[PDB]
Design an enzyme around this catalytic site. Structure first.
Site, PDB file in Angstrom:
ATOM      1  CD  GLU A   1     -60.466-115.464 -54.524  1.00 28.90           C
ATOM      2  OE1 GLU A   1     -60.666-114.501 -55.297  1.00 28.90           O
ATOM      3  OE2 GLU A   1     -59.971-115.358 -53.381  1.00 28.90           O
TER       4      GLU A   1
ATOM      5  CG  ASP B   1     -59.419-118.022 -51.211  1.00 27.17           C
ATOM      6  OD1 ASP B   1     -59.056-116.837 -51.385  1.00 27.17           O
ATOM      7  OD2 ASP B   1     -60.506-118.442 -51.685  1.00 27.17           O
TER       8      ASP B   1
ATOM      9  CG  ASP C   1     -62.034-107.002 -54.222  1.00 25.03           C
ATOM     10  OD1 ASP C   1     -61.967-107.100 -52.989  1.00 25.03           O
ATOM     11  OD2 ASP C   1     -61.567-107.886 -54.991  1.00 25.03           O
TER      12      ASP C   1
ATOM     13  CB  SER D   1     -60.079-112.319 -52.663  1.00 25.31           C
ATOM     14  OG  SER D   1     -61.297-112.046 -53.367  1.00 25.31           O
TER      15      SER D   1
ATOM     16  CB  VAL E   1     -58.052 -98.473 -40.487  1.00 25.51           C
ATOM     17  CG1 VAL E   1     -57.893 -97.645 -41.749  1.00 25.51           C
ATOM     18  CG2 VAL E   1     -57.285 -99.788 -40.599  1.00 25.51           C
TER      19      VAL E   1
ATOM     20  N   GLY F   1     -62.074 -93.407 -39.641  1.00 25.91           N
ATOM     21  CA  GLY F   1     -61.972 -92.554 -38.471  1.00 25.91           C
ATOM     22  C   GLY F   1     -61.668 -93.333 -37.218  1.00 25.91           C
TER      23      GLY F   1
ATOM     24  N   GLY G   1     -62.230 -95.504 -34.171  1.00 27.70           N
ATOM     25  CA  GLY G   1     -63.214 -96.530 -33.842  1.00 27.70           C
ATOM     26  C   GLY G   1     -63.754 -97.206 -35.087  1.00 27.70           C
TER      27      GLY G   1
ATOM     28  CG  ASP H   1     -63.461 -96.788 -40.228  1.00 26.91           C
ATOM     29  OD1 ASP H   1     -63.423 -97.688 -41.096  1.00 26.91           O
ATOM     30  OD2 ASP H   1     -62.493 -96.423 -39.513  1.00 26.91           O
TER      31      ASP H   1
HETATM   32 CA    CA Z   1     -61.320 -96.827 -37.604  1.00 22.46          CA
END
Ligand code: CA
Length: 368
Positions: free
Chosen positions: A78, A82, A168, A285, A327, A342, A344, A346
């Protein structure tokens, strides 16, 4: 476009950040549990392999002087993820990287809490990465939520940005950390805090030439144990909606998350040096340190004068869709359950990922 692994030094190209300054003028923190001794060797391997100048690091024992700050083996992976992703996303340079180490021998969640507290009290890191979390209801039940929220509130008032991985487990955070649970949805702490930036996860597609192609929801389905691997998102059952989120109409009066998202699929993840060996790693992460590195560039570009950016993100992005890669495809559940992406904002991915040069241009014109 594509799906493949990426050297984190490629994230500036992918998210349109190459023309911005590096984070050379911004100090960045990372919250860890336990020590980072192997992580610092892996970081040296990372900078040397990529022909970059070494990064100035400091490690900080945030609790008792007699606390346990030995390395946690898995944790090294981790802190590797990072640190390398931050330095990569930042253009290969940060002023200093501060590892705020939680005591592992402290009671309950108090070690972690004191790690957050130290970073806020010192108030030297402008941006702080938190690639961790767990079921907000558990944190709520034992008082950890309330304790930690006060620290994050102080941070925001101070103009520090905490970046927190959204989780996750898709929508099934509180069902034994990601076991499918039908229509029963939950979220992660501390991402559900209104005083942090919550960062979700995408599936990142790139062109043969390595340019941005597109992003879908991070959802890689179930592992061999039956656990879901997908971007955390939904709304807090405890935290109220901060007023800037009102632009997302038709949602409850609760803190919606994530705010933004970046690369998280393992299949499109980062190639990370871990105990000297390269591994392809994903998760939110990953997504959070990408944001941290990119945001630290904008800080350096703006004399570290940008305050806690949540309100500005919501006003700016809702009125200026070109600032983000929106996305639109996928979901963060299983078996037909879960939230859908969708147009805008989401629940799986928030506003999506930032186009950094366009955001920088916006800030130059409008501030933030
Ligand atoms: Ca979206």
């Amino acid at each position: 476009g594509t799906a493949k692994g990426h050297n984190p030094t490629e994230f500036p190209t992918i998210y349109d950040a190459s023309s911005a300054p590096t984070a050379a003028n911004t100090t960045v923190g990372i919250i860890t549990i336990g020590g980072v001794s192997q992580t610092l060797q892996d970081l040296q391997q990372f900078t040397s392999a990529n022909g970059l100048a070494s990064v100035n690091t400091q490690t900080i024992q945030t609790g008792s002087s007699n606390g346990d700050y030995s390395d946690d083996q898995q944790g090294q992976g981790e802190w590797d993820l990072d640190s390398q992703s931050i330095v990569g996303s930042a253009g290969g340079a940060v002023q200093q990287l501060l590892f705020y180490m939680a005591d592992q021998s402290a009671s309950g969640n108090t070690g972690l809490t004191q790690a957050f507290n130290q970073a806020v009290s010192d108030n030297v890191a402008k941006v702080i990465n938190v690639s961790l979390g767990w079921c907000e209801a558990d944190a709520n039940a034992d008082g950890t939520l309330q304790a930690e929220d006060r620290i994050f509130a102080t941070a925001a008032a101070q103009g520090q940005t905490f970046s927190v991985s959204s989780g996750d487990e898709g929508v099934y955070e509180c069902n034994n950390r990601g076991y499918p649970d039908g229509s029963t949805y939950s979220v992660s702490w501390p991402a559900s805090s209104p005083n942090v930036i919550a960062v979700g996860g995408t599936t990142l597609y790139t062109t043969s030439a390595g340019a941005y192609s597109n992003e879908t929801v991070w959802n890689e389905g179930l592992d061999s144990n039956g656990k879901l691997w997908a971007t955390g998102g939904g709304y807090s059952v405890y935290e109220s909606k901060p007023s800037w989120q009102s632009v997302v109409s038709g949602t409850p009066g609760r803190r919606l998350l994530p705010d933004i998202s970046f690369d998280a699929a393992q299949g499109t993840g980062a190639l990370i040096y871990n105990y000297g060996q390269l591994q392809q790693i994903g998760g939110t992460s990953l997504a959070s340190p990408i944001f941290v590195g990119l945001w630290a560039r904008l800080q350096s570009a703006n004399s570290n004068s940008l305050g806690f950016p949540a309100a500005s993100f919501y006003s700016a992005i809702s009125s200026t869709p070109s600032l983000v890669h929106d996305v639109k495809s996928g979901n963060n559940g299983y078996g037909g359950y879960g939230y859908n992406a969708g147009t805008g904002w989401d629940y799986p991915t928030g506003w999506g990922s930032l186009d950094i040069a366009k955001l920088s241009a916006y800030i130059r014109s409008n501030g933030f």
